[PDB]
Amino acid sequence: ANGPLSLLQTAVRSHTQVLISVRSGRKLLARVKAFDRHCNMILENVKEMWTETPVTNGKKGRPVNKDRFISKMFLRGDSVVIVLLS
């Protein structure tokens, strides 16, 4: 309501896209469907991208950004580095 989590409520009240950086080094782009005080959120229309360096024949290749589309998302709170309300 009046705390920081209200922006997630503002994410609920507007259904806007949100960019989430996670402690695994990956990034999420999703619309916030539900949240709580414990920052456990449920998301819809989810597109998750990350960066990996493929090692081909023992040589470290260039970093490639790839992605995956997930319809329904249950992201757990403590792994989130940071949340950006776009």
Binding site: A34, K72, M73, F74, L75
Partner: protein
Amino acid sequence: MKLVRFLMKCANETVTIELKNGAIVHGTIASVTPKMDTALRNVRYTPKGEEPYSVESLTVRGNTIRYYILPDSLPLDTLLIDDAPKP
């Protein structure tokens, strides 16, 4: 509102579990604890790059999970009703 009750309401669903260390679990949910640990059946487990193995049941303890992928046919809006009593 606590999301553990929403974990209670989404039982008997074939989900995919991504853990805090990196292993992947998949299968249909048997039950979930009020401390958000969950026991699951018809389990396939993939570790970091070695061969996956399938077991009939697996009780994964929830402080080491990263996230879930639920079935896309799950009616989230029907589960969003608050059945807990008002204090």
